[PDB]
Amino acid sequence: PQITLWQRPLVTIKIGGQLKEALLDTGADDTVLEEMSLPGRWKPKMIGGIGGFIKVRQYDQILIEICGHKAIGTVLVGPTPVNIIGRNLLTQIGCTLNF
Amino acid sequence: PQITLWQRPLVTIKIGGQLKEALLDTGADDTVLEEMSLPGRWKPKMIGGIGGFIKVRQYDQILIEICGHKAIGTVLVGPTPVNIIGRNLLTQIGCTLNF
Numbered sequence A, B: 001p002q003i004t005l006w007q008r009p010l011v012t013i014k015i016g017g018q019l020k021e022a023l024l025d026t027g028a029d030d031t032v033l034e035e036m037s038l039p040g041r042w043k044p045k046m047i048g049g050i051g052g053f054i055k056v057r058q059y060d061q062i063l064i065e066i067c068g069h070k071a072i073g074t075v076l077v078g079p080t081p082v083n084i085i086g087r088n089l090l091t092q093i094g095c096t097l098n099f
């Protein structure tokens, strides 16, 4: 689709069989989701932004579906204010900025 | 233009005759710029992100030019690592997300 930015670009994702909403975020390098149990082994990591650093769990090779498009990649899980879809997965689904 | 997301979407902006670089950021509601001393009246404000909150100064009605495109609006100034262009100015330049 083409998404305008008058409101926040929140979409539905599917992951681990759940439905969530997430934010399509060109200002993020990585994907961060709220705390949840995913299958698989994980590594403790840190990530930062405005305000500082949070501890997350890194999950590799996770399948995720974003408005019906599949992406397979790294997800960080942890105490984020909002579910963030970053540039690591936006590129997989062919996302660009246009003006 | 069409900007791809392989790298961070940094573009050149002009603010006050000064050129700078800034991140085009669909996940930010607000525009946030590195410390500088603008003329005009400011409000104190706090904005949040991943690790918590920072203190910023709010300027209103600031003109910025983003890749030859003018936008006018509110800007927050503070101790940010990166200049961030958020949806408040991105919408004015006609910027969309496409996939």
Ligand SMILES: CC(C)[C@H](NC(=O)N(C)Cc1cccc[nH+]1)C(=O)N[C@@H](Cc1ccccc1)C[C@H](O)[C@H](Cc1ccccc1)NC(=O)[C@@H](NC(=O)N(C)Cc1cccc[nH+]1)C(C)C
Residues within 6 Å of the ligand: A008, A023, A025, A027, A028, A029, A030, A032, A047, A048, A049, A050, A081, A082, A084, B025, B026, B027, B028, B029, B030, B032, B047, B048, B049, B050, B081, B082, B084
């Ligand atoms: C999510 C996280 C992995 C990401 N970090 C990175 O991508 N990093 C650290 C890579 C990097 C390093 C050096 C230089 C540039 N990039 C990030 O926080 N990116 C933010 C930009 C930034 C980078 C580095 C250092 C400081 C800032 C931009 C994101 O869009 C971020 C996403 C987010 C939104 C809401 C809550 C938490 C995170 N926005 C923000 O932090 C904005 N907040 C914001 O808009 N709100 C709090 C309102 C809101 C609420 C809900 C939904 C949307 N918006 C700020 C910039 C104003």
